[PDB]
């Protein structure tokens, strides 16, 4: 499953709605 996923220097993110 995948719907908003940032990524950053070194740390991403993941959320889901």
């Not at 499953?1 to 709605?17: L, N």
Request: overall charge positive.
């Amino acid at each position: 499953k995948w719907c908003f996923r940032v990524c950053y220097r070194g740390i991403c993110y993941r959320r889901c709605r």
